[PDB]
Design a protein around this ligand. Structure first.
Ligand SMILES: CC[C@H](N)C(=O)N(C)Cc1ccccc1F
Ligand SMILES: CC[C@H](N)C(=O)N(C)Cc1ccccc1F
Ligand SMILES: CC[C@H](N)C(=O)N(C)Cc1ccccc1F
Lengths: 237, 300
């Protein structure tokens, strides 16, 4: 059934599973036309497919050409997502295929179920959690590869960098969701926090800065404060 | 005009014959029903006064044999049987009629209700849904489950309706996932009509039979089947024009005949709202939409 606070440790057991977030698949800018009507212009998007245990991210870049001449794009985007996730699963060796796929939005359930009919033993699950994966495009290196793409492309990132050498998957996922929640609530502040100290660099093969254990505690504290601050600025508390 | 005679009525029972029903008192001089119109299937059904649990009944066609009812005190029900001795049967019926012991099927001459509810229903197709090949008539009751219900437990007592499942490989062509899920025309016209049913008359026959089992026995799996067969048509963008016109007539008479006080359980809100207001065929069911809105505007 649905994935929620109660069955949260299941994410870090040894059954392979993937989260799929389709928020950033179909992305547009809305603008005025010369005649004063409104039109959209699509920009490149991406499917965010994440193994929460290992940090393995299969970032499938969705190039604007896939929308050319199509109608009802918000609906098509869900089916395109499901087609690409199905293709990914089929590309993986049997022992790497997931036992469960958790979609972050319930409207992905039927498209993904229909595309995965060939895999009756792979459970397709919703979640009650409000996960912040839409903020993936606030990670500079991810946004850069999406915007520069000239054709459909799959790119591989470990979203935990090397954290799993020092912390457990549970702790890594909690750090990731904190960083992403912060970037989602106030991107400018969050990014100021992460880069304020010019002596802490991001390795070429990494996404996040090379914080020591002690610096991660400070960073994490600054992100929590931001989220509460913004929560007070929003609600006046 | 044909006759379904009864050896007696030893237990108090409400007896239905098609859309009509009547009450028989315990050990009341009763020897059955006469003047049954030839040319249609018929259903004779029972609800005991002491145990409204289990409505049960028999589908039959008097052209296929001489049938009578006899109570079995061991199994505790009214059973249908065939009398092979034609002369013996005619004699019994003639004597019953001379004694005015048989009630009269109350058919009004202007009234086409039963024809309209059974237009496409054939006894031979009933006997393939209800498998008991040693009898020419078919038993159905409130509790019998469908093949599909059993997949999700006694197979000899099952309703073998055609399985319809919108999220199945039968329904969804590889490579046409979105197309076939949002527009079920392939599944309707190629898989079901051309492939399984062969023509729309057999499809409508099963649809009508499922509705009638839902209405008369409260058979939940039959209700599921009736709604699935409606939804498969309404969710197809491409349906033969003759089928849409006929479906509107079929559903009109079904909704017209439904007891008002049973609509809560026998009508699925989601399917009907989708079919009348959101589906491809939202504009193709004028008669059905008009009777639904004037009779059940709450459900919608
Ligand atoms: C240089 C590190 C390298 N990017 C890596 O970590 N691989 C490719 C593991 C991996 C495999 C599949 C998907 C995502 C993944 F991150
Ligand atoms: C409950 C009223 C029923 N619908 C009806 O119209 N009549 C004629 C009762 C009846 C029906 C069939 C045979 C004999 C009967 F006495
Ligand atoms: C059977 C329904 C009702 N309880 C009743 O007693 N009817 C109407 C009388 C009757 C008529 C014909 C034949 C037999 C009959 F008993």
């Amino acid at each position: 059934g649905a994935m929620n606070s109660s069955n949260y440790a299941e994410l870090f057991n040894n059954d392979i599973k993937l989260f799929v977030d389709d928020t950033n698949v179909y992305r547009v800018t809305v603008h005025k036309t010369f005649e004063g009507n409104v039109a959209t212009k699509a920009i490149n998007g991406c499917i965010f497919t994440l193994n929460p245990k290992t940090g393995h991210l299969f970032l499938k870049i969705i190039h604007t050409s896939v929308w050319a001449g199509q109608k009802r794009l918000s609906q098509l985007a869900k089916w395109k997502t499901a087609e690409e996730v199905s293709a990914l699963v089929r590309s993986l060796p049997k022992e790497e295929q997931p036992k469960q796929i958790i979609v972050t939005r319930k409207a992905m359930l039927d498209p993904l179920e229909v595309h995965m009919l060939d895999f009756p033993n792979i459970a397709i699950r919703p979640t009650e959690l409000r996960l912040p994966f839409s903020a993936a495009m606030s990670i500079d290196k991810l946004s850069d590869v999406v915007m520069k793409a000239t054709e459909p492309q799959m790119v591989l990132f470990n979203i935990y960098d090397d954290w799993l050498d020092r912390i457990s998957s549970y702790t890594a996922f909690s750090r990731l969701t904190l960083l992403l929640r912060a970037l989602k609530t106030n991107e400018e502040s969050a990014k100021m926090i992460l880069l304020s100290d010019p002596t802490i660099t991001i390795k070429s093969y990494h996404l996040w800065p090379s914080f020591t254990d002690e610096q991660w505690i400070t960073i994490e504290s600054q992100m929590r404060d931001l989220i509460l601050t913004e929560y007070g600025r929003k609600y006046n508390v | 005009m044909n006759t379904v005679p009864f050896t007696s009525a030893p237990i108090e029972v409400t007896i239905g014959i098609d859309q009509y029903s009547f009450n028989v008192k315990e050990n009341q001089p009763f020897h059955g029903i006469k003047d049954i119109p030839i040319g249609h299937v018929h259903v004779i059904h029972f609800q005991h006064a002491d145990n409204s649990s289990m409505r049960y009944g028999y589908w039959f066609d008097c052209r296929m044999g001489n049938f009578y009812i006899q109570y079995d005190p061991k199994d505790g029900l009214y059973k249908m049987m065939e009398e092979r001795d034609g002369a013996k049967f005619e004699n019994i019926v003639h004597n019953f009629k001379e004694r005015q012991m048989m009630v009269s099927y109350p058919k009004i001459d202007e009234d086409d209700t039963w024809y309209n509810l059974t237009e496409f229903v054939q006894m031979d197709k009933i006997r393939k849904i209800v498998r008991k090949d040693e009898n020419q008539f078919s038993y159905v009751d409130s509790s019998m489950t469908t093949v599909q219900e059993n997949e999700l437990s006694d197979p000899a007592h099952s309703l073998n309706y055609t399985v319809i499942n919108f999220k199945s490989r039968e329904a969804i062509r590889p490579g046409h996932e979105m197309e076939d899920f949002l527009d079920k025309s392939y599944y309707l016209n190629t898989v079901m009509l051309q492939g399984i049913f062969k023509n729309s008359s057999n499809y409508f026959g099963e649809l009508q039979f499922a509705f009638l089992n839902a209405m008369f026995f409260g058979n939940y799996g039959s209700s599921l089947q009736w709604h699935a067969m409606i939804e498969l048509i309404c969710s197809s963008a491409t349906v033969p024009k003759h089928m849409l016109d006929k479906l509107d007539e079929i559903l009109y008479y079904q909704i017209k005949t439904l007891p008002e006080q049973y609509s809560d359980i026998l009508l699925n809100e989601r399917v009907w709202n989708i079919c009348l207001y959101s589906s491809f065929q939202k504009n193709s069911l004028h008669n059905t939409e008009k009777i639904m809105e004037n009779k059940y505007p709450e459900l919608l």
